[PDB]
Each structure stands twice: as structure tokens, then as C-alpha cells.
């Protein structure tokens, strides 16, 4: 709206969460990623800002998508795991890493959201360290 004084930043469509063209392939590592890693992060007191795609309009981050080219969030990851979108653990780990990276490159060091990301990432990496073979 020309009426706006403060810029608004529009949102992309959210990331895809299923892929009709891949077989339904379950592994112990993917089960662990959903049921141990994602679940432990999801229930953490700092998870809530990470649980859905960044809404740059509702959160007043009008420059978010200028800075972040590959958005990712734990809601998308959770859905991708539940839908068997991933071929392997590495692909899921990549999406968690993207989510954390986005936070670290958009927000200033020391920002509260960065401190939250750091606590979550520590837990994530602890859990990853115990990935079943
Ligand atoms: C994690 C995604 N993210 C950012 O990178 C910056 C940001 C800001 C907010 N805004 S918010 O929910 O009003 C709250 C989030 C906790 C820090 C203070 C601001 C939510 C998510 C994100």
C-alpha cells in the first residue's frame, strides 16, 4: 500500500514439504531426527520463534528476504520428516543448519534471538553427536 510509511516485506511461498516423486524410505537415523532431535528442540522454551516460516510482515522484518535467500524453519523440517521428504539424515541436518545460519546472518550478534538460536543449536549438535549408526 502506498499508504505505508514503514516498508513492508512480502513473504515467499513456504518451502515444499513433500515430494510425490521419491519412494517412502525410512531409516533409524531419520526416525531419530524426528523423534529425538526435532522433538527435543520443539519442546524447548526457546523453540517458538523457530516453529514456523518467518512472516516478515507480521514480525516487522521488511528486509528479511533481501538478506535470507533460503528460508528454513523447524515446522518445515518437522513436516519434511513426517512426510519422508528426505533421502537421508544429512539432508535433514542441512536444513537445521540452514535454519540456524539464517538467524546468525540476519540478526546482530548478541541479539536475544541469536542467544536463543545458540542454545537450540547446542542441543541440536549434542543430539546429532549421538546419531545411531
Ligand atoms: C528465527 C527467525 N527470526 C529471526 O531471524 C528474527 C526473528 C524475530 C521474531 N520476532 S518475535 O517473535 O516478535 C521475538 C522473537 C524472540 C526475540 C524477540 C523478538 C521471530 C523470529 C525471528
UniProtKB/Swiss-Prot annotation:
Post-translational modification note: Phosphorylation by CK2 disrupt the intramolecular binding between the bromo domain 2 and the NPS region and promotes binding between the NPS and the BID regions, leading to activate the protein and promote binding to acetylated histones. In absence of phosphorylation, BRD4 does not localize to p53/TP53 target gene promoters, phosphorylation promoting recruitment to p53/TP53 target promoters.
Compartments, record wording: Nucleus; Chromosome
Highest taxon, organism lineage: Eukaryota
UniProt crosslink position (Glycyl lysine isopeptide (Lys-Gly) (interchain with G-Cter in SUMO2)): 66
Site (Acetylated histone binding): 107
Cysteines engaged in disulfide bonds, as pairs: none
Bromo domain: residues covered: 25-131
Tissue: Ubiquitously expressed.
Disease listed for this protein: Cornelia de Lange syndrome 6: A form of Cornelia de Lange syndrome, a clinically heterogeneous developmental disorder associated with malformations affecting multiple systems. It is characterized by facial dysmorphisms, abnormal hands and feet, growth delay, cognitive retardation, hirsutism, gastroesophageal dysfunction and cardiac, ophthalmologic and genitourinary anomalies. CDLS6 inheritance is autosomal dominant.
Quaternary organization: Interacts with p53/TP53; the interaction is direct. Interacts (via CTD region) with CDK9 and CCNT1, acting as an associated component of P-TEFb complex. Interacts with RELA (when acetylated at 'Lys-310'). Interacts (via NET domain) with NSD3, CHD4, BICRA and ATAD5. The interaction with BICRA bridges BRD4 to the GBAF complex. Interacts (via NET domain) with JMJD6 (via JmjC and N-terminal domains); the interaction is stronger in presence of ssRNA and recruits JMJD6 on distal enhancers. Interacts with NSD3. Interacts with NIPBL.
Annotated function: Chromatin reader protein that recognizes and binds acetylated histones and plays a key role in transmission of epigenetic memory across cell divisions and transcription regulation. Remains associated with acetylated chromatin throughout the entire cell cycle and provides epigenetic memory for postmitotic G1 gene transcription by preserving acetylated chromatin status and maintaining high-order chromatin structure. During interphase, plays a key role in regulating the transcription of signal-inducible genes by associating with the P-TEFb complex and recruiting it to promoters.
Similarity section: Belongs to the BET family.
Miscellaneous comment: JQ1, a thieno-triazolo-1,4-diazepine derivative, and I-BET, a benzodiazepine derivative, have been tested on tumors with success. Treatment with GSK1210151A (I-BET151, a I-BET derivative) has strong effets on mixed lineage leukemia and promotes myeloid differentiation and leukemia stem-cell depletion.
Annotated domain remarks: The NET domain mediates interaction with a number of chromatin proteins involved in transcription regulation (NSD3, JMJD6, CHD4, GLTSCR1 and ATAD5).
Protein name as catalogued: Bromodomain-containing protein 4
Organism: Homo sapiens
Residues of the full protein shown: 44 to 166 of 1362
Amino acid at each position: 500500500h502506498h499508504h505505508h510509511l514503514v516498508p513492508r516485506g512480502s513473504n515467499p511461498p513456504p518451502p515444499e514439504t513433500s515430494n510425490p516423486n521419491k519412494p517412502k524410505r525410512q531409516t533409524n537415523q531419520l526416525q531419530y531426527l524426528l523423534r529425538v532431535v526435532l522433538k527435543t528442540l520443539w519442546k524447548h522454551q526457546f523453540a517458538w520463534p523457530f516453529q514456523q516460516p518467518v512472516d516478515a510482515v507480521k514480525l516487522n522484518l521488511p528486509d528479511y528476504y533481501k538478506i535470507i535467500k533460503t528460508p528454513m524453519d523447524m515446522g518445515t523440517i518437522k513436516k519434511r520428516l513426517e512426510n519422508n521428504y528426505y533421502w537421508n539424515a544429512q539432508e535433514c541436518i542441512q536444513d537445521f543448519n540452514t535454519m540456524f545460519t539464517n538467524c546468525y546472518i540476519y540478526n546482530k550478534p548478541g541479539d536475544d534471538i541469536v542467544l536463543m538460536a545458540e542454545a537450540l543449536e547446542k542441543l541440536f549438535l549434542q543430539k546429532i553427536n549421538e546419531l545411531p549408526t
